[PDB]
Design an enzyme around this catalytic site. Structure first.
Site, PDB file in Angstrom:
ATOM      1  N   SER E 148       0.858  -1.175   0.000  1.00 48.45           N
ATOM      2  CA  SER E 148       0.000   0.000   0.000  1.00 48.45           C
ATOM      3  C   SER E 148       0.895   1.225   0.000  1.00 48.45           C
ATOM      4  CB  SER E 148      -0.937   0.024   1.200  1.00 48.45           C
ATOM      5  OG  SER E 148      -1.759   1.174   1.159  1.00 48.45           O
ATOM      6  N   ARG E 149       0.676   2.106  -0.960  1.00 49.57           N
ATOM      7  CA  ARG E 149       1.543   3.251  -1.168  1.00 49.57           C
ATOM      8  C   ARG E 149       1.096   4.467  -0.372  1.00 49.57           C
ATOM      9  NH1 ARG E 149       5.341   4.217  -4.984  1.00 49.57           N
ATOM     10  NH2 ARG E 149       4.990   2.061  -5.677  1.00 49.57           N
ATOM     11  N   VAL E 150      -0.213   4.631  -0.178  1.00 49.36           N
ATOM     12  CA  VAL E 150      -0.719   5.655   0.727  1.00 49.36           C
ATOM     13  C   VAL E 150      -0.472   5.249   2.173  1.00 49.36           C
ATOM     14  CG1 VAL E 150      -2.842   6.848   1.429  1.00 49.36           C
ATOM     15  CG2 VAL E 150      -2.385   6.429  -0.963  1.00 49.36           C
ATOM     16  N   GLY E 151      -0.476   3.943   2.439  1.00 48.57           N
ATOM     17  CA  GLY E 151      -0.719   3.301   3.721  1.00 48.57           C
ATOM     18  C   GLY E 151      -0.239   3.896   5.024  1.00 48.57           C
TER      19      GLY E 151
END
Lengths: 116, 118, 284, 64, 215, 116, 71, 71, 72
Positions: E148-151
């Protein structure tokens, strides 16, 4: 050595050698343990933890997130600092106080700030 | 000429028969043909047949050809080894180990097979 | 079919082939030193065997409790396994044979007792909840007489307490580099004692019964140490054979994977050139 | 001890050389130390080689 | 769920331009509510079935092929779609549009052309693996490879404080489960965190069509 | 579970779980053999061979291939047979006694004719 | 070493024909000394760049491609 | 054996069209006796060398090929 | 191990032909045994001498930049 000098080349090369030797002990440390590590390798992990924590800085950008003011470290001072860590001058200091500092005098001032 | 007019038994050495197949592939790529399996010409078996069906024994004489094969990518199923091997009758594996041992010729006795040994 | 994945699988199984070949070489060297220890032990065993023969088989002398056969109220078991794994069926054959004999002729947990040598057999009989008195753990590759001396002294003295009434050994006999047969050998009482070539009579200096009282435990301890040296030799030979078979299996996997690699690189070359020439023919 | 007129050989479980009653005890105290050092060295060498084999077969199983 | 959802269907018997124009119709329907301040979720149930229809209508319009006979602008085909899934600023209204594209892989080959085109566009990925699906772990989320890049900025604080050590426990279990396949019986601390990781795996299982609230 | 029932579903998923664990152990079995598996993986392999061979069945159509008359197994009986294999009831039988066999009593009688 | 060395250069920003004609200029400078009796060493730094550049020229001239679209 | 068998040969040096029509000539010579009531055995030595030749004959017709460049 | 000179031997001077032919064999015997030296005592005299001479000829064949050594 033509570009960085001979001292910088041998200091960075010994840092790379002890970090490679620490990378090829990771399964042994994680599974078997520190007690079975066959000393002259326990000194390698003892110096390599302090080297890989001294590689981190306090950035000027991260002052807004931590409050620590940030540092600009010249190349002569970081070669002198890693040379003094490789010589074993700062093996008596704890494993921390290398975290998020600029120069090598900041290591001993942070370590005596923690009572050491 | 020496098979037909003279009627004698002739050797015909082709050093690196793989260079024949890849030069045919290059002439086919220059001629604008659509490539066949892997990078070889469509006429790989036909060019190899038009080469190696004139190396035969007639009633007049014979032509027996000793040929070097490269076998690229150490792959005996690559089409350029695989279409030469459909014409071969014997293999004489030359080994470095028998040459360093002091045996000349260095023909590996176990690796060397022949269709005629029957 | 995923040419890069095939080549990474080839390199991984080449690495396992190299590691198991190194372990084969280490076990060859340890087999050499184990058979050197056995051939250094053998004159002591020859001399004490002929002394036990000439004493216990000459002029009666069956008054000692280790010569007579008493009725068995219990039965000891001495099981010699390895400390370390990666032998093929060194441990499993012995432990299965001990389990078969105990479940075949006792059917009662107090009628037997087990003396393990090794961690594998110890963990085996703790998984299967069997009573284990003596335990000895973490022997060297090349064991001397001291550690097996204290546990063999405890074993023979525990027979002398009136507990076992007989006991058996179970180990792997080093017949060859491939075989390693499993032997059941009866340690005590010394009923199957064989006569030597020149039956000579001694002058028993206190008496024959006192020298038997002090000497027959040493004969039983030497039997235990000879069985343990034979078992360590068969252990290192079994690990040598297991790593040789592992390298052969890895190399057969290498050749089938290189066949698959050649098929996949052929399919990759022809698929990419079909794409390139289709994109070229699309323009005209 | 068993003595024949040419076979006066001695079967000892531990026979020192240094002509003193306690030097066998001192030799046993030294060889117990050397023996458990070897008993730990052999085990850690096997477990290092076995970690190498277990990681090398891990990468084979992950490679699929 | 049909009190708040819209289902756009372009099926296999329908022509290729309808499979080509189904995600863009879904994003236009989403942007109608995104530019009103509402929050929209859009799921494309196979975006690798849009690429085949676009490949079809490109090759039938006599456009030249490329890798795997897809045209050149297939990355642009997916990225023009997926960059219309944004979260707007407060001056634009405050609305968002979260997207969930799907990609079917072939024999787990995530290094194929359309999977690596869409992996390089999205803000992270969730790997579903049959190797974990048939071991009891359902949902089959490979929690190590799934990024997950926002995570962390997505999560609430209560999920954050405890997921930060869930991830450490499960990564330690993934690292040390490799040394428990065969061999020689790892010690008590390693077996303690193997048991921690196995209970973590048994926690992260669910059943079908029963979601759990956040609390 | 809402269609085939609960018991059918648990037997099916546990069959698939043991076959997936055996497929995972294929490489260790291929190189190092059955000797190093840690005494539950030996049980996984020992049950999964039996499960893999009790998936095979004799057909009515395959009577012309082998001479064996062929079977029709109802759903309750194949769920009961695979549940009894998963419970450990048939570990003592040999694994070649499970090939090409309709129900689990026929496994019993085929192992009886083999001589177990 | 520049008392006896000639340097021929064709950078990445140069047109693909100069990349294609750099080594032939190298041997054209070398054969003049070879056929006078001298000894010449000619060093071709990355001929794979020449292969890529001649691939580029043949594909822009739409000559028929082969393996890896080289002519 | 030549009192009852027929040999239909199309060798390796022959062009691909004669390699393509050898088995069809084999069945065309066999069906004369098949539809008279006789029993005919027909052996095709290397049909993979028919498939290779039809691949040749179709790539020269510039037909787009599939797996292993076969039509 | 992977490199080869198809002229080699006809190229070298007479003083190099006498000495290089056994350094080739020392590197062959070292690179076939380099992966076996991380653990274990293989053989105390026949293999460890090969490992010793190979680990020293690797250090012989190392150089630095812009210092060509004459063939003498």
């Amino acid at each position: 050595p033509e570009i960085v000098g001979e001292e910088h080349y041998q200091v960075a090369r010994k840092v790379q050698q002890t970090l490679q030797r620490y990378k090829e002990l990771q399964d042994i440390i994680a599974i078997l343990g520190m007690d079975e590590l066959s000393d002259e390798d326990k000194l390698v992990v003892h110096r390599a933890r302090r080297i890989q924590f001294f590689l981190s800085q306090n950035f000027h950008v991260a002052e807004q997130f931590t409050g620590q003011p940030g540092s600009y470290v010249p190349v002569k001072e970081t070669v002198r600092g890693f040379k003094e860590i490789l010589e074993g001058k700062y093996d008596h200091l704890p494993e921390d106080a290398f975290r998020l500092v600029g120069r090598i005098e900041e290591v001993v001032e942070k370590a005596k700030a923690m009572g050491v | 000429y020496f098979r037909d007019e003279q009627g004698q038994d002739v050797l015909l050495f082709i050093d690196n028969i793989f260079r024949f197949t890849q030069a045919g592939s290059e002439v086919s790529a220059l001629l604008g043909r659509m490539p066949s399996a892997v990078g070889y010409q469509p006429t790989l078996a036909t060019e190899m047949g038009q080469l190696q069906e004139r190396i035969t024994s007639t009633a007049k004489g014979s032509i027996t050809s000793i040929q070097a094969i490269y076998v690229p990518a150490d792959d005996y199923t690559d089409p350029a080894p695989a279409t030469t091997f459909s014409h071969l009758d014997a293999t004489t594996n030359l080994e470095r180990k028998l040459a360093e041992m002091g045996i000349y010729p260095a023909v590996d006795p176990l690796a060397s097979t022949s269709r005629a040994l029957a | 079919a995923s040419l890069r994945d095939i080549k990474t699988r080839i390199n991984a199984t080449k690495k396992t082939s190299q590691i198991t070949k190194a372990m084969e070489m280490v076990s060859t060297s340890k087999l050499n030193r184990a058979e050197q220890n056995a051939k250094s032990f053998v004159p002591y065993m020859e001399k004490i065997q002929e002394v036990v023969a000439n004493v216990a088989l000459g002029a009666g002398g069956a008054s000692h409790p280790m010569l007579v056969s008493r009725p068995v109220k219990k039965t000891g078991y001495l099981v010699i396994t390895s400390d370390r794994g990666l032998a093929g069926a060194y441990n499993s054959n012995v432990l299965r044979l001990v389990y078969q004999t105990i479940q075949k002729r006792h059917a009662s947990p107090d009628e037997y007792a087990i003396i393990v040598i090794g961690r594998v057999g110890l963990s085996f009989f703790r998984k299967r909840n069997m009573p284990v008195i003596l335990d000895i753990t973490r022997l060297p590759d090349q064991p001397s007489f001291a550690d097996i001396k204290e546990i063999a002294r405890k074993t023979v003295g525990l027979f002398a307490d009136g507990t076992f009434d007989e006991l058996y050994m179970y180990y792997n006999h080093y017949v060859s580099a491939i075989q390693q047969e499993v032997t059941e050998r009866k340690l005590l009482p010394l009923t199957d004692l064989a006569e030597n070539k020149q039956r000579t009579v001694y002058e028993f200096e206190p008496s024959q019964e006192e020298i038997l009282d002090v000497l027959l435990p040493q004969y039983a301890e030497s039997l235990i140490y000879g069985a343990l040296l034979d078992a360590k030799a068969s252990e290192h030979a079994a690990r040598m054979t297991a790593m040789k078979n592992a390298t052969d299996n890895a190399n057969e996997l290498i050749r089938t994977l290189t066949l698959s690699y050649n098929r996949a690189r052929q399919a990759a070359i022809t698929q990419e050139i079909t794409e390139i020439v289709a994109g070229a023919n699309a323009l005209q | 001890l068993e003595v024949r007129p040419d076979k006066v050989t001695i079967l000892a479980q531990a026979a020192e050389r240094a002509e003193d009653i306690d030097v066998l005890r001192a030799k046993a105290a030294k060889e117990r130390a050397e023996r458990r050092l070897q008993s730990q060295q052999d085990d850690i060498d096997f477990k290092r080689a076995e970690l190498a084999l277990k990681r090398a077969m891990n990468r084979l199983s992950v490679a699929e | 769920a049909l009190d708040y959802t819209i289902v756009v269907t372009a099926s296999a018997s329908q022509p290729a331009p309808l499979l080509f124009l189904a995600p863009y119709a879904g994003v236009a329907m989403g942007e109608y509510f995104m530019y009103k301040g509402k929050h929209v979720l859009v799921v494309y149930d196979d975006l690798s079935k849009q690429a085949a229809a676009y490949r079809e209508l490109s090759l039938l319009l006599r456009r030249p092929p490329g890798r795997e006979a897809y045209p050149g602008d297939i990355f642009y085909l997916h990225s023009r779609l997926l960059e219309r899934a944004a979260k707007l600023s407060d001056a634009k209204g405050g609305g968002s549009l979260t997207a969930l594209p799907f990609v079917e892989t072939q024999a787990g080959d995530i290094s194929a052309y359309i999977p690596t085109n869409v992996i390089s566009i999205t803000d992270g990925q969730i790997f579903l693996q049959s190797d974990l699906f048939f071991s009891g772990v359902r949902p089959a989320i490979n929690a190590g490879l799934s990024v997950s890049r926002v995570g962390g900025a997505a999560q609430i604080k209560a999920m954050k404080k405890v997921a930060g050590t869930l991830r450490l426990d499960l990564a330690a279990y993934r690292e040390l489960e490799a040394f428990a396949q065969f061999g020689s019986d790892l010690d008590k601390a390693t077996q303690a965190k193997l048991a921690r990781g196995a209970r973590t795996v048994e926690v992260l299982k669910q059943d079908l069509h029963q979601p759990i609230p956040v609390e």
